[PDB]
Design a protein around this nucleic acid. Structure first.
Ligand SMILES: [K+]
Ligand SMILES: [K+]
Ligand SMILES: [K+]
Ligand SMILES: [K+]
Ligand SMILES: [K+]
Ligand SMILES: [K+]
Ligand SMILES: [K+]
Ligand SMILES: [K+]
Ligand SMILES: [K+]
Ligand SMILES: [K+]
Ligand SMILES: [K+]
Ligand SMILES: [K+]
Ligand SMILES: [K+]
Ligand SMILES: [K+]
Ligand SMILES: [K+]
Ligand SMILES: [K+]
Ligand SMILES: [K+]
Ligand SMILES: [K+]
Ligand SMILES: [K+]
Ligand SMILES: [K+]
Ligand SMILES: [K+]
Ligand SMILES: [Mg+2]
Ligand SMILES: [Mg+2]
Ligand SMILES: [Mg+2]
Ligand SMILES: [Mg+2]
Ligand SMILES: [Mg+2]
Ligand SMILES: [Mg+2]
Ligand SMILES: [Mg+2]
Ligand SMILES: [Mg+2]
Ligand SMILES: [Mg+2]
Ligand SMILES: [Mg+2]
Ligand SMILES: [Mg+2]
Ligand SMILES: [Mg+2]
Ligand SMILES: [Mg+2]
Ligand SMILES: [Mg+2]
Ligand SMILES: [Mg+2]
Ligand SMILES: [Mg+2]
Ligand SMILES: [Mg+2]
Ligand SMILES: [Mg+2]
Ligand SMILES: [Mg+2]
Ligand SMILES: [Mg+2]
Ligand SMILES: [Mg+2]
Ligand SMILES: [Mg+2]
Ligand SMILES: [Mg+2]
Ligand SMILES: [Mg+2]
Ligand SMILES: [Mg+2]
Ligand SMILES: [Mg+2]
Ligand SMILES: [Mg+2]
Ligand SMILES: [Mg+2]
Ligand SMILES: [Mg+2]
Ligand SMILES: [Mg+2]
Ligand SMILES: [Mg+2]
Ligand SMILES: [Mg+2]
Ligand SMILES: [Mg+2]
Ligand SMILES: [Mg+2]
Ligand SMILES: [Mg+2]
Ligand SMILES: [Mg+2]
Ligand SMILES: [Mg+2]
Ligand SMILES: [Mg+2]
Ligand SMILES: [Mg+2]
Ligand SMILES: [Mg+2]
Ligand SMILES: [Mg+2]
Ligand SMILES: [Mg+2]
Ligand SMILES: [Mg+2]
Ligand SMILES: [Mg+2]
Ligand SMILES: [Mg+2]
Ligand SMILES: [Mg+2]
Ligand SMILES: [Mg+2]
Ligand SMILES: [Mg+2]
Ligand SMILES: [Mg+2]
Ligand SMILES: [Mg+2]
Ligand SMILES: [Mg+2]
Ligand SMILES: [Mg+2]
Ligand SMILES: [Mg+2]
Ligand SMILES: [Mg+2]
Ligand SMILES: [Mg+2]
Ligand SMILES: [Mg+2]
Ligand SMILES: [Mg+2]
Ligand SMILES: [Mg+2]
Ligand SMILES: [Mg+2]
Ligand SMILES: [Mg+2]
Ligand SMILES: [Mg+2]
Ligand SMILES: [Mg+2]
Ligand SMILES: [Mg+2]
Lengths: 114, 209, 56, 118, 61, 123
RNA sequence: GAUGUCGGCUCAUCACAUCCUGGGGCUGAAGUAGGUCCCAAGGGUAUGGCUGUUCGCCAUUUAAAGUGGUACGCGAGCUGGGUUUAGAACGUCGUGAGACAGUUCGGUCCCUAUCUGCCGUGGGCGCUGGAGAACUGAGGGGGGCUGCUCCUAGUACGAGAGGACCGGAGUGGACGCAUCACUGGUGUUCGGGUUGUCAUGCCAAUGGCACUGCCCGGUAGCUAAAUGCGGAAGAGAUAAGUGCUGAAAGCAUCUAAGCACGAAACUUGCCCCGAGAUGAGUUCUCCCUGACCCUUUAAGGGUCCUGAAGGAACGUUGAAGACGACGACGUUGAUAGGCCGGGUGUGUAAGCGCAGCGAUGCGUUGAGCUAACCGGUACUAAUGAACCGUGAGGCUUAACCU
RNA sequence: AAUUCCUUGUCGGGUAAGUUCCGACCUGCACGAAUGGCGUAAUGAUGGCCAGGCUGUCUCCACCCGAGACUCAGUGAAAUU
RNA sequence: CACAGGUGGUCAGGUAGAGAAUACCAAGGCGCUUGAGAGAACUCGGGUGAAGGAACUAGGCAAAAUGGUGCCGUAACUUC
RNA sequence: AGGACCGAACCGACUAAUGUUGAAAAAUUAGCGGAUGACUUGUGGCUGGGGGUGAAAGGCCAAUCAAACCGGGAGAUAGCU
């Protein structure tokens, strides 16, 4: 209700950039090893977005060292330091789950040039 | 220590600065008014009766109205009792706020679990279903055997069978108190507590510790 | 499965002790036509709460 | 369990329910009062009233939408030419249900459902 | 129970006998007779014969 | 989420190409093994001149799963296949000398420091 | 005048002759690790290969993979591989029909629960005027498992190798309870793509049917693989065992008098049910303060008047529910529908314009549509009434006022 | 071995593990040459074993759509005793 | 039995299709002689399913899966 | 050309589930085999009970088959209940 909505508004981030499925994004996240805390960059195609307020999430898919990796980021998590859109993709679906069966040329996404 | 009566508002998350998401239940604990104090001389045991919330004046019956009026408090939506330790002492009409849990680390939350209705043995007691194929006849989710032969020639009491599941009093123990918000009358506890959204909860300091 | 012994008329009556019907507690009286009707239902003449709701 | 679920199955499959409510909405718009069973009337509210809310605003898109909901140009025309203007100021509740006893054939609870300005 | 037990009796009765020599691990088994006692006697004879055969094999080696 | 009969790829260069989980170690009635868990494997396919031969039984540590792992903030990392790294029965140290493909932070233990150091990328 | 069977499956329940975990004695017990016996039944006590198998062997685990009873538990619960009819064949026997604790291939498993029992859920009356609540707790049930790592400490012990007791912390397996914030499943009630065909006069745009035609996403709800929590600590009395003081028996002696320890067993502590606990309990509050007549004259029956507190009924309903029941609400109202705004999902509707020969693209346009969600809103339906329930509540004896 | 009791014979293959299967061996309880012997392409709703695909068969079940079961109105059996 | 059984011949429209298959239709004929609700267990008939993938079982039973046309190409063995 | 191939009608009946006081005294649903032949089907005919007929199962001969049904001998006989 209003109580929960208030508790979530006071936590939600304010600078989340606009991105859409098919966009290529780079997400800088905080990696804590021993005592040192640094940023690791995960770059790939956004294949799913879940708009749920504080509980918003998005899935990014990349091909790292010959293996397909999908990572689901909680948008307002403090561990997600930064999100930047490196390329705008032109798709017609909200969820690009068909990309899991495609590799190389077949997985190309046309650029949204406007 | 005594507890409080609250309402289950819902579930959320709290993001700590070190990147941890804590699942929390939000409990709206408004002021609890003491409507009666019981002692050894008159009642044989030491406890306080409290009420909370508000009720329709035309849905408060005259017996309830008189009981509230003797205490001099507004009619709440119910009455609950809390046993008193020998140190604790309250007075009729006193109001107790969520600040009582300011220094409490863990709590026990009791509520009426969500009702499932008439439930089968598979759902209610985690019985294993019989084979779905391989000739099985009409006996896919049935209990199976329910006893031995002529000895004892009966079914034992407490046999696990199908029946009403849920809609009963359930207590979850030793939940962390994530946050006590006095101004909003909020108790944020870590984890899930019994009952649906908008149900009554009884929150006590943890008895195990 | 079937009975080993014939049940009695006593047991039959005991079972049927809960089969009794309940008469309607009371009938409402329309404020305009004066006709008795089931509460929250229209009358036989097409009246409900004093208003002619269905003609004929 | 059916916790927080809406819609009556009415001992029918989905396509049958949809067709029956399309027909019943057409009949209710045509005659402005019909006699059906009480559960069917309570379900017919949730179908007919959005049609009138749609007909409140007259446009080609809305007319085609109303046709898709109720495949009858007579009902579409009556909606958009009479019922929209008739119920323009009314917020909701364009229908009322009056319980009217029990059906002789099967003791089914019956009710008239009619337009509130009839 | 013996294999291919045919009848209520045979299905129910424990007639087959197996004898295992713990030091050696050699096992003999008999289920030819309806009587457990006869099967045990025959299996004992076979076990004695197998132990003797093992010792004779060692000596011949 | 690896159980018995599950076929896994090999993330090292020990020579195996396909292995099969035959036991999830570490507890009675234990069902699944996630990333960072040790399983008993048999080698189903191997390269001709590898350090291991088809039909061998040894241990492995699961390093990639399709079910994925979950981080404290609720995030989940999923891979496209199930991959493990072979280990000796006794020492439980990696057999190969190279590790192929990314591994996760769940291996950050004094037990699997060799795998962490050799991994191309740690997530 | 019929008590169906081996094994498996589902579900068990008890014993103890204890497999693990708990306690102890002796040891040919240095430590680690064992042997053996005593106490202890609280919990726990594998997955696979082969075989119809029980058994067994084998692989790999585990703290452990206990031994038994229960019609060798359990077919009006399932199965039907073996067994066990009728077909057929091999070996073998018989001249033959046929036969084989020889083998081989094939071969109908019914029952709508009356009673007891059991799991749940109501109705009636009772509890001594009626009623609404909150309790107490006699009693009953649930729960009770354990690994590994680290510290103590490379300490005690040991020639070395190796390597503790006691105590403390962390993190797991299995199990159970709850919940849906996250990750997911489902989501024939939301959006879209698309094949065939038919129809809406036609175009365009839509609808029907083809398993939701096939699909791709997905709200609410339900849900696990998801994520919170639990087993305890403590106390009492003990088992085997260890003792103290101490005679009988000048010594000795744990015992006879007296005293102290002593375990997952017991009884509590934790959770749930619980006053039909007929021994029906307690507390708080509310309501009812009229007259008359008879009889067999009393816990008697009428007559009139009166009809309370409250309940029930009806209606709108509900994360409550098979029906009952339980909860919310009924105009002095947010109970449901609608409506409004938001959200969410889907993915840029139609119509028009432009480009293109055209399929189509672009713009308008993140457009359109959007269930169960959230916040509001009396527009619709929750009607005044009526119905049940009474009129101060027995006797005896105490104590107190009187 | 549709035949072998002993017997899950022994050895090889296949599997982490194989009383089944395949290849040998010969010690044929109790094969054997028209109640034919030994082969054999093709064929088989024929028996056994193995692999790939594929999956709720299973780990371990969850949700959904319908027909019943449940309630109301009408009619209205049965075995058994 | 107003019974999901059996019962010979003749006729043979459209679109897609090789087709008398199959889908939607025409002419024509029907909605199957109890309904109304609700939306428990359980049974029946379907749909979908994370990770795994025969670990199930006597046995891959059941289910899932494959599926058209044209072209390329196709092993042992063979009675060719 | 073919007791050729694929596949409807047609003829059958290999598997499973359902049903088992059934919709049905042998079926339904999903699959399955044959489908120019030793094929299938209509009408009529003939073979008769120790008889027929049987690509052989003691199968079939009117829901009856190691000797059909109906009537008679007949109140067979029953050391049995
Ligand atoms: K009727
Ligand atoms: K012990
Ligand atoms: K000992
Ligand atoms: K025990
Ligand atoms: K055996
Ligand atoms: K047992
Ligand atoms: K029985
Ligand atoms: K009885
Ligand atoms: K969820
Ligand atoms: K969901
Ligand atoms: K169409
Ligand atoms: K002494
Ligand atoms: K009472
Ligand atoms: K409303
Ligand atoms: K557009
Ligand atoms: K447009
Ligand atoms: K939108
Ligand atoms: K032979
Ligand atoms: K001959
Ligand atoms: K064959
Ligand atoms: K004859
Ligand atoms: Mg419920
Ligand atoms: Mg059956
Ligand atoms: Mg079934
Ligand atoms: Mg009755
Ligand atoms: Mg609702
Ligand atoms: Mg019905
Ligand atoms: Mg008898
Ligand atoms: Mg003992
Ligand atoms: Mg005991
Ligand atoms: Mg105890
Ligand atoms: Mg087998
Ligand atoms: Mg016995
Ligand atoms: Mg047994
Ligand atoms: Mg038995
Ligand atoms: Mg039985
Ligand atoms: Mg059999
Ligand atoms: Mg021969
Ligand atoms: Mg057969
Ligand atoms: Mg049965
Ligand atoms: Mg107990
Ligand atoms: Mg939610
Ligand atoms: Mg989803
Ligand atoms: Mg659609
Ligand atoms: Mg068109
Ligand atoms: Mg049509
Ligand atoms: Mg359809
Ligand atoms: Mg313990
Ligand atoms: Mg109930
Ligand atoms: Mg949106
Ligand atoms: Mg459209
Ligand atoms: Mg071998
Ligand atoms: Mg052989
Ligand atoms: Mg001869
Ligand atoms: Mg021959
Ligand atoms: Mg043939
Ligand atoms: Mg009836
Ligand atoms: Mg009929
Ligand atoms: Mg017919
Ligand atoms: Mg045609
Ligand atoms: Mg057809
Ligand atoms: Mg009918
Ligand atoms: Mg259903
Ligand atoms: Mg089903
Ligand atoms: Mg779907
Ligand atoms: Mg499916
Ligand atoms: Mg799956
Ligand atoms: Mg999958
Ligand atoms: Mg696979
Ligand atoms: Mg197997
Ligand atoms: Mg196998
Ligand atoms: Mg098995
Ligand atoms: Mg099959
Ligand atoms: Mg299929
Ligand atoms: Mg042919
Ligand atoms: Mg054919
Ligand atoms: Mg035939
Ligand atoms: Mg068929
Ligand atoms: Mg053929
Ligand atoms: Mg015919
Ligand atoms: Mg016949
Ligand atoms: Mg004769
Ligand atoms: Mg006679
Ligand atoms: Mg005579």
């Amino acid at each position: 209700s209003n109580i929960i909505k208030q508790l979530e508004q006071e936590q939600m981030k304010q600078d989340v950039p606009s991105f859409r499925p098919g966009d290529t994004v780079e997400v800088k996240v905080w990696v804590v090893e021993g005592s040192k805390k640094r940023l690791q960059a995960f770059e790939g195609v956004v294949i799913a977005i879940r708009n749920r307020g504080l509980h918003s999430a998005f899935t990014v898919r990349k091909i790292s060292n010959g293996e397909g990796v999908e990572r689901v980021f909680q948008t307002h998590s403090p561990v997600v330091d930064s999100i930047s859109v490196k390329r705008r993709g032109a798709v017609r679906k909200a969820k690009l789950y068909y990309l899991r069966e495609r590799t190389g040329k077949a997985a190309r996404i046309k650029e949204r040039l406007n | 220590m005594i507890g409080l009566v609250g309402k289950k508002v819902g579930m959320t998350r709290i993001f700590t600065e070190d990147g941890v998401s804590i699942p929390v239940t939000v409990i709206e604990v408004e002021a609890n008014r003491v409507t009666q104090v019981k002692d050894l001389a008159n009642d044989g045991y030491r406890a306080i009766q409290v009420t909370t919330g508000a009720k329709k004046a035309n849905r408060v019956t005259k017996p309830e109205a008189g009981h509230f009026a003797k205490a001099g408090v507004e009619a709440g939506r119910g009455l609950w009792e809390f046993r008193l330790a020998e140190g604790e002492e309250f007075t009729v009409g006193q109001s107790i706020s969520v600040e009582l849990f300011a220094d409490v680390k863990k709590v026990d939350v009791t509520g009426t679990s969500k009702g499932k209705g008439f439930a089968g043995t598979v759902k209610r007691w985690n019985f294993r279903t019989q084979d779905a194929t391989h000739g099985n006849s009409l006996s896919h989710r049935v209990p199976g055997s329910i006893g031995q032969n002529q000895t004892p020639g009966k079914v034992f009491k407490g046999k696990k069978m199908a029946g009403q599941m849920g809609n009963e009093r359930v207590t979850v123990q030793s939940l962390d108190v994530v946050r006590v918000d006095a101004e909003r009358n909020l108790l944020l506890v870590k984890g899930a507590v019994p009952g649906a959204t908008g149900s009554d909860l009884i929150v006590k300091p943890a008895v195990k510790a | 499965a079937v009975q080993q012994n014939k049940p009695t008329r006593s047991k039959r009556g005991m079972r049927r002790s809960h089969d009794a019907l309940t008469a309607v507690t009371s009938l409402s009286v329309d404020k305009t036509s004066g006709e008795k009707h089931l509460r929250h239902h229209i009358t036989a003449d097409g009246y409900y709460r004093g208003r002619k709701v269905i003609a004929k | 369990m059916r916790h927080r679920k809406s819609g009556r199955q009415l001992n029918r499959n989905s396509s049958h329910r949809q067709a029956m409510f399309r027909n019943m909405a057409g009949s209710l718009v045509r005659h402005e009062i019909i006699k059906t069973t009480l559960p069917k009337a309570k379900e017919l509210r949730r179908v007919v009233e959005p049609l009138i809310t749609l007909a409140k605003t007259d446009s080609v898109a809305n007319r085609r939408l109303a046709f898709a909901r109720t495949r009858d140009n007579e009902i579409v025309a009556k909606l958009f030419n009479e019922l929209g203007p008739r119920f323009a100021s009314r917020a909701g509740g364009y229908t009322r249900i009056l319980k009217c006893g029990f059906r002789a054939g099967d003791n089914a609870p019956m009710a008239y459902i009619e337009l509130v300005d009839r | 129970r013996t294999s291919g037990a045919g009848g209520q009796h045979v299905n129910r009765t424990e007639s087959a006998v197996r004898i295992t020599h713990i030091p050696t691990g050699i096992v003999t088994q008999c289920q030819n007779d309806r009587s457990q006692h006869k099967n045990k006697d025959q299996a004992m004879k076979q076990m004695k014969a197998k132990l003797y055969e093992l010792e004779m094999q060692k000596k011949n080696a | 989420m690896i159980q018995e009969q599950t076929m896994l790829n090999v993330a090292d260069n020990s020579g195996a190409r396909r292995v099969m989980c035959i036991k999830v170690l570490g507890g009675s009635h234990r069902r699944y093994a996630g990333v960072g868990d040790i399983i008993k494997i048999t080698i189903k396919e191997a390269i001709p001149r590898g350090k291991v031969k088809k039909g061998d039984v040894l241990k492995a540590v699961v390093v990639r799963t399709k079910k994925g792992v979950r981080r404290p903030d609720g995030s989940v990392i999923r891979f496209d296949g199930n991959a493990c790294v072979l280990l000796n029965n006794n020492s439980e140290q990696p057999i190969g000398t190279r590790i192929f493909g990314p591994v996760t932070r769940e291996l950050r233990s004094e037990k699997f420091m060799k795998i962490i150091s050799l991994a191309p990328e740690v997530l």
